Amino acid sequence: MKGILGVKVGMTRIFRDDRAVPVTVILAGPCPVVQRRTPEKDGYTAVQLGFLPQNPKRVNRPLKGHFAKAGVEPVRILREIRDFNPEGDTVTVEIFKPGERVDVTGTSKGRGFAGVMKRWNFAGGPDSHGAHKIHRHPGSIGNRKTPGRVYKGKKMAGHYGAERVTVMNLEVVDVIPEENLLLVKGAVPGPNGGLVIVRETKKAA
Amino acid sequence: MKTYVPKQVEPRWVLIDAEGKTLGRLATKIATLLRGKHRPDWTPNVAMGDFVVVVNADKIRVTGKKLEQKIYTRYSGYPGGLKKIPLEKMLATHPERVLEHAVKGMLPKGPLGRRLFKRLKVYAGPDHPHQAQRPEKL
Amino acid sequence: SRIGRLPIPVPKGVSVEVAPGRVKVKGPKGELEVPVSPEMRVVVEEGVVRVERPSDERRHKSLHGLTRTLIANAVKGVSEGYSKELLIKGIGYRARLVGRALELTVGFSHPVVVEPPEGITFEVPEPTRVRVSGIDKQKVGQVAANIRAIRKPSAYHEKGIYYAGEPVRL
RNA sequence: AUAACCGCUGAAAGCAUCUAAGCGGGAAGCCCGCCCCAAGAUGAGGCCUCCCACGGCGUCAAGCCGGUAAGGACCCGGGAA
RNA sequence: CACCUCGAUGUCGGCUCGUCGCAUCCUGGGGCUGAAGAAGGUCCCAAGGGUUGGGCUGUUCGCCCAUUAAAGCGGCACGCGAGCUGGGUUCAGAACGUCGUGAGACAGUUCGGUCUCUAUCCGCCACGGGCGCAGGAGGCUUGAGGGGGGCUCUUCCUAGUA
Ligand SMILES: [Mg+2]
Ligand SMILES: [Mg+2]
Ligand SMILES: [Mg+2]
Ligand SMILES: [Mg+2]
Ligand SMILES: [Mg+2]
Ligand SMILES: [Mg+2]
Ligand SMILES: [Mg+2]
Ligand SMILES: [Mg+2]
Ligand SMILES: [Mg+2]
Ligand SMILES: [Mg+2]
Ligand SMILES: [Mg+2]
Ligand SMILES: [Mg+2]
Ligand SMILES: [Mg+2]
Ligand SMILES: [Mg+2]
Ligand SMILES: [Mg+2]
Ligand SMILES: [Mg+2]
Ligand SMILES: [Mg+2]
Ligand SMILES: [Mg+2]
Ligand SMILES: [Mg+2]
Ligand SMILES: [Mg+2]
Ligand SMILES: [Mg+2]
Ligand SMILES: [Mg+2]
Ligand SMILES: [Mg+2]
Ligand SMILES: [Mg+2]
Ligand SMILES: [Mg+2]
Ligand SMILES: [Mg+2]
Ligand SMILES: [Mg+2]
Ligand SMILES: [Mg+2]
Ligand SMILES: [Mg+2]
Ligand SMILES: [Mg+2]
Ligand SMILES: [Mg+2]
Ligand SMILES: [Mg+2]
Ligand SMILES: [Mg+2]
Ligand SMILES: [Mg+2]
Ligand SMILES: [Mg+2]
Ligand SMILES: [Mg+2]
Ligand SMILES: [Mg+2]
Ligand SMILES: [Mg+2]
Ligand SMILES: [Mg+2]
Ligand SMILES: [Mg+2]
Ligand SMILES: [Mg+2]
Ligand SMILES: [Mg+2]
Ligand SMILES: [Mg+2]
Ligand SMILES: [Mg+2]
Ligand SMILES: [Mg+2]
Ligand SMILES: [Mg+2]
Ligand SMILES: [Mg+2]
Ligand SMILES: [Mg+2]
Ligand SMILES: [Mg+2]
Ligand SMILES: [Mg+2]
Ligand SMILES: [Mg+2]
Ligand SMILES: [Mg+2]
Description:
The structure is cut from a larger assembly and holds chains A (about 200 residues), B (about 140 residues) and C (about 170 residues). With about 200 residues, chain A is an all-beta fold. Chain A has strands at about 5-15, 20-25, 100-105, 110-115, 160, 165-175, 180-185, 195-200. In chain A, the strands form 2 sheets. Chain A has a 6-stranded antiparallel barrel with strand order 1-2-7-6-3-8. In chain A, strands 4-5 form a two-stranded antiparallel sheet. The longest helix of chain B has 11 residues, at about 25-35. Chain B is globular, with a radius of gyration of 17 Å. In chain B, β3 (about 70-75) and β4 form a beta hairpin. Chain B has a 3-stranded parallel β-sheet, covered by helices on one side. In chain B, strands 3-4 form a two-stranded antiparallel sheet. Chain B has helices at about 25-35, 65-70, 85-95, 100-105, 115, and strands spanning about 15, 50-55, 70-75, 80-85, 120. Chain B has 5 helices and 5 strands; from the N terminus they run βαβαββαααβ. By secondary structure, chain C is an alpha+beta fold. In chain C, about 20% of the residues lie in helices and about 20% in strands. Chain C is built from 2 helices and 12 strands. Chain C has a 3-stranded antiparallel β-sheet, covered by helices on one side. A 3-stranded antiparallel β-sheet of chain C has the order 7-8-9, with no helix packed on it. Chain C starts with 16 loop residues before the first strand and ends in an 8-residue tail after the last strand. The chains are: A mainly beta (about 200), B alpha/beta (about 140), C alpha+beta (about 170). Chains in contact: A-B. At the A-B interface, loops of A face loops of B. The complex binds magnesium ion (52 copies). One magnesium ion binds near residues 130 and 132 of chain A. Chain A binds 2 RNA strands through β4, β5 and β6. The PDB classes it as ribosome.
């Protein structure tokens, strides 16, 4: 179930078959598999997949040269791939052919305390007529004596954004192995320079 | 003459089979066992009861059309968050819950009611950790 | 009066073995296992196999006939027990056959392949008539039904998969 | 896996019956599947990798005080947080 | 009817935000048809989601225009004024008709007419601090259990075939 880590680089249009193709260039660098963990001593199947190299030994003792190729532990080994057993070593952009759909998981841009209406697309109040200090307010939040309380999931204002988000079934417009670049078209979450993980699609699986 | 009251006494362990045993009928007993009400030094405020182990928990028999008709409900704090679960699915998904649940509801409520439930290790089919004793019974 | 329950089956080149829960027939055409009520004792006599009920309760009588018949079929089964007709009427409607699998074109924007289950054998003596061969009979009647169920008769005129029998109306 | 329903096999009730024993089909619904949260799941799970088994006291029960180790904070430069 | 509330349980309609019931408006699945087909009628299952924009009137409702797969009926203090509105009702001004000798009066009409910055507890949306998870740490995780989502039309091929 091929997966790979990477950083959202940017967006741009492509042109193909005399057609504009809006895409999001993600860099899916070589991912040194550092652990596997099978139903033997884990109960499932995955692949620790350390990403960006870096670390002039800000690595301390929790380092794992245990699995040979630690090639100086990477900044974010974080996240396995679950039910993926690679070409033995080092996973790269090669796992993706132009024309495959993919599921990108990202960390959506944060908006902090966002009001109902944005958080939730509420209509708020009228900007004129009666009006009165309730223009962007949520209105009523309940009934009367029964139930005499607010529902468990009542859509209200709160922190919104900066969360796990997975835009699904994205076309792979192109892949450039020379530079570990991968071009999906459109809507990958989070900011540029944020970390994402690209996976096989779930439309087929 | 003050009534006698036991000291720390013995942490007993008992093994039961389950397979073929009804359910509530077995639950009744496992409860009385859980709170040493068979012991002549029974005490309501202490918890001087046996630890019960149960194997073959999935071969619990049951009468009538209870496999289909009997339903376990669960309310999440949310709207429409009342889930309904029939015996069949439970057993097929999580046996050892069907019996655990029949005993939980037959132990008294309270902080001591709990704990007594903790002293109950229900397992699917046979097998389990055999650290302590296990004088099997009926 | 006179109940298809306590009469007696038959033998001839076929075996019968009573287990407390079921009975195994077996014959020149294969073997069948007949799950039967734990109550109700089936006994194997000379060239026959009686079935007798414990009580006379309206509930034991009901299980009696059933049990008797249920076994007998298994006996007819292991010595020729298949059949079930299947005559496909209607104009453009024809039935072919692809190896073990039966392919029939009955008016859709496509033909329907009806690959057969184990124990069952398909035959198409002429393209406008099929037959379902088997030992089971519960399976035969099922598969025969399924195949016909692909829509069919009942219509406003002779069009669709019929059994051998059933005339129809307007 | 099911609803209405459609059937197979089939007695009671010789015939017949989808049903009383059984089995098969059958819904935008139900359970999974997708997405997100989630071990305070006090039933607090797992795997990998690190530091180690001090000094006095507590004479026994669990402890008390220091330094320490792997680490971790404090402080500071910042951040689509 | 007059049982809690008159040392106060703010009253219609709109707005906002919903949530639930199913006696189902649409979509899914069915049986019957006085069902040729297409299209309907009628009853059964089904509450997952959906269920338009305008003119008139304070209106709810309803009539109407243009659409639609459909323009569903109800409950929640005729849900929701410590959330808004204040057009209606429902104080003091004024007028008409009417009634009364009169002062005045009208589920009759008319024009006007003070809607009160601070959330303690519960509840809800978010975010932490503490302790626990019996050695202490840095990573990576399983998912018990929750939540989200769930709609639908047109055209074309089949085939102008049955
Ligand atoms: Mg921000
Ligand atoms: Mg939003
Ligand atoms: Mg918008
Ligand atoms: Mg809106
Ligand atoms: Mg509006
Ligand atoms: Mg606005
Ligand atoms: Mg105002
Ligand atoms: Mg204003
Ligand atoms: Mg209020
Ligand atoms: Mg099925
Ligand atoms: Mg029949
Ligand atoms: Mg069925
Ligand atoms: Mg089925
Ligand atoms: Mg759908
Ligand atoms: Mg998670
Ligand atoms: Mg842990
Ligand atoms: Mg691991
Ligand atoms: Mg009164
Ligand atoms: Mg009175
Ligand atoms: Mg008061
Ligand atoms: Mg008050
Ligand atoms: Mg009706
Ligand atoms: Mg319908
Ligand atoms: Mg028609
Ligand atoms: Mg109809
Ligand atoms: Mg109904
Ligand atoms: Mg108006
Ligand atoms: Mg209306
Ligand atoms: Mg009106
Ligand atoms: Mg309208
Ligand atoms: Mg409503
Ligand atoms: Mg009322
Ligand atoms: Mg009201
Ligand atoms: Mg107000
Ligand atoms: Mg109001
Ligand atoms: Mg007014
Ligand atoms: Mg005003
Ligand atoms: Mg006068
Ligand atoms: Mg008045
Ligand atoms: Mg006015
Ligand atoms: Mg004025
Ligand atoms: Mg007025
Ligand atoms: Mg106020
Ligand atoms: Mg309170
Ligand atoms: Mg906390
Ligand atoms: Mg523990
Ligand atoms: Mg779950
Ligand atoms: Mg839900
Ligand atoms: Mg769910
Ligand atoms: Mg929902
Ligand atoms: Mg024409
Ligand atoms: Mg055709």
